[PDB]
Amino acid sequence: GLEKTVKEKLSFEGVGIHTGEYSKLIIHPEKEGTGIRFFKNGVYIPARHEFVVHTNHSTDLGFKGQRIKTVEHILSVLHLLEITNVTIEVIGNEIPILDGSGWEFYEAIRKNILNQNREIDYFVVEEPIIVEDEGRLIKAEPSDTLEVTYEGEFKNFLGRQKFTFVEGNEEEIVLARTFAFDWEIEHIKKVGLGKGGSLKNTLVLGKDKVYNPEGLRYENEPVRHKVFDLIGDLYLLGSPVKGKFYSFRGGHSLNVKLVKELAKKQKLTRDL
Ligand SMILES: C[C@@H](O)[C@H](NC(=O)c1ccc(C#CC#Cc2ccccc2)cc1)C(=O)NO
Ligand SMILES: [Zn+2]
């Protein structure tokens, strides 16, 4: 498809899930060849793996002393809509979490797309690859379309779940919310994170129950969200991606490990 930007500036705002601080975004149109980048305090931070500074419970980027936490959800939405040129100005320290899903970003951006004049140079996975870490695994292989499967094995009533995204089914993952388990939240807070987490933006699960009065949006909401996360992290390759991916219990750290291995393989087709 064609490279795309946004027609008009778009703004979003609200608390960040990890900092608990209120932040604001302004998404700016950009010309062909710009790529996706963030902007904070006069500094541009490209949405690329080289700028990753943290991957525990979120994917965070930084450059020249400026940091932005939790880029994965806005990047996933941009990846899914194939927005390729845009500046995300951040006033604050984190992307707003909103309702925990990509829905608000997705609906607003989808109605505000501007087609541009050259085609997208997709990052096309050229051969099979597997990355592993402590029982977790992610595999990628060539595909003309983006296909992403996540399989989880949860230590509560959910047990084993898997979900597969394919192109055309974007609406199946952009409403799936971030989630946490009650027995893990104390640790997360103790290590300086989750300060903005609440039942308003997080699906909170116990061994045998759901805390949110509204319940789950889908019986497999957690693995839908994990697919959504992975698609955001994959955009750190710097272009929309064509490939078939399977993640078993993956998280941001493993996702970024995969991205870095893929990028290394193709640095001399991509940089040209
Ligand atoms: C999903 C995973 O990949 C990941 N999310 C997290 O790791 C995470 C961690 C903690 C919290 C939280 C919280 C809370 C709370 C709370 C609620 C009610 C009362 C008191 C505290 C949310 C997300 C994620 O979505 N990355 O994109
Ligand atoms: Zn997430």
Swiss-Prot record:
Q: Does the keyword Signal apply?
A: no
Q: Which residues bind Zn(2+)?
A: H73, H225, D229
Task: Show the Gene3D superfamilies listed in the entry.
Answer: lpxc deacetylase, domain 1, lpxc deacetylase, domain 2
Q: Which GO terms describe its cellular component?
A: membrane
EC number assigned by the record: 3.5.1.108
Catalytic activity reads:
a UDP-3-O-[(3R)-3-hydroxyacyl]-N-acetyl-alpha-D-glucosamine + H2O = a UDP-3-O-[(3R)-3-hydroxyacyl]-alpha-D-glucosamine + acetate
Q: What does this protein do?
A: Catalyzes the hydrolysis of UDP-3-O-myristoyl-N-acetylglucosamine to form UDP-3-O-myristoylglucosamine and acetate, the committed step in lipid A biosynthesis.
This one is known as UDP-3-O-acyl-N-acetylglucosamine deacetylase
Q: What is the lineage of its organism?
A: Bacteria, Pseudomonadati, Aquificota, Aquificia, Aquificales
Q: Which gene encodes it?
A: lpxC
